[model samples]
Target: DVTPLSLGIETMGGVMTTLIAKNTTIPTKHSQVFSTAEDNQSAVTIHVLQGERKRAADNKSLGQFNLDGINPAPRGMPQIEVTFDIDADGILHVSAKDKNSGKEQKITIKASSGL
Candidate 1:
């Protein structure tokens, strides 16, 4: 059997938030909740990465996208949900949503040698 791939996103303060850990079973999915670090933040750019590194910058960057439509609120007031899905063919899919506004974004990482 093939090893499950690592999946994660860059967060505020450049932290690497791991959603699906490496060696997990294929066709797996996981969700993690995140929040804005500042008040009135309208959008969040999630930089997807793949690796075992502690820092986001140290990992292999797969891609990135913006999750907009966040309601204006105090820091940590809004709940942003991030989901990671990996298929049997080693393809990765990511999604982000604003719990309050119901706005969301999704991406499927095309297999490639580089970002």
Candidate 2:
């Protein structure tokens, strides 16, 4: 069984949006381009989570990290590229990077296998 869908969490204007969702189909690749909210912020954190809740606080937080060596730019200038890829075995993989700096990060989500 695929069970339930897992989702990413983000806080914006007192609300959170799902950056990714579970049961999205294996061997899938999706990408999103985002911008930072502040100026002079060289690095940006990708707050990863898995759940269906609207707010991050209500869902289970998987992990987060700041992409290193990003070039500082205006709030709308710093571009963040996010990629989600699920393998043929129903395993999920995620990658994020600074578009301008070319720095990248990746993660994999394994499906449950035992009781």
Candidate 3:
């Protein structure tokens, strides 16, 4: 019971981009690549949420983290990949990696009410 109906990441314009939807099985892994909008960005921050809302702020704030060590470059020159893994016990493991540098940052969401 109390399973999530939708899982997504916060994108530009406060939108909720769903990576995994309702009825997905546990112990799953999903990854998507994103790019920088501005030049010389050294870090990227991702907001993770779980819900059916359209706006990111309206959904449940599962957790968030910033991926550092990104090599400075022009917009869209660097590839940042985000990996989301759901374990058997409903724990959410999220990681963001800088493809150019292979540097990553991760966060784990467990039994917490919110993050």
Candidate 4:
């Protein structure tokens, strides 16, 4: 009656970076750091997805948002922390923050089909 599928987000190089895998038992929290792929990047887009596919576009896209106001730095120099939190009700929440610049964006995904 609860979640049994994987949950993830698109990462650099159009890849699916998994935070919660098959048979995930939550409530759970996970955080990972990602860097910019282009020079002078000051914004990052969080593409929330679900599935086991290696290619992010091949998975189910749940939601997406962007975190801006990052200090434009060279590629791989900026640090962006992305957090995933899923509660007992199986509702998904996400946060992306640029620590230095104090920029943050969040999203909440309720349980539904393709979840």
Say which candidate scores most in TM-score.
Answer: 4
TM-score of model 4 vs. true structure:
0.83
- Candidate 3: deviation at residue 96, Å? 0.9
lDDT of 3 by residue, 11-112 (tens): 652567777655776667777788865667777778776777644587666776777766668867777777887765667788878766778878887623
Give candidate 1's TM-score. Answer: 0.81
What is candidate 4's local distance difference test score?
0.73
Better of 1 and 4 by lDDT: 4
Number of the candidate with higher TM-score, 1 or 4: 4
Q: Determine which window of 10 residues in candidate 3 has minimal summed lDDT.
A: 106-115
lDDT of 3 at 104: 81
Best-to-worst ranking by lDDT? 4, 1, 3, 2
What C-alpha lDDT values do all the predictions have? Answer: 0.71, 0.60, 0.70, 0.73
Backbone clash tally (model 2): 3
lDDT of 2 by residue, 16-111 (tens): 456546656545567888777656666776665667764456565555555654676776777677776655554556666775667787776653
From the highest TM-score down, the ranking of the candidates is 4, 1, 3, 2
- RMSD (Cα, Å) of model 1: 2.6
Model 4 lDDT at residue 94: 87
lDDT of model 3 at residue 28? 71
Candidate with top lDDT is 4
Pairs clashing in candidate 2?
Answer: 6-22, 7-51, 27-86
Candidate 1 weakest ten by summed lDDT: 1-10
Which is the winner by lDDT between candidate 1 and candidate 3? Answer: 1
lDDT of 1 at 44: 72
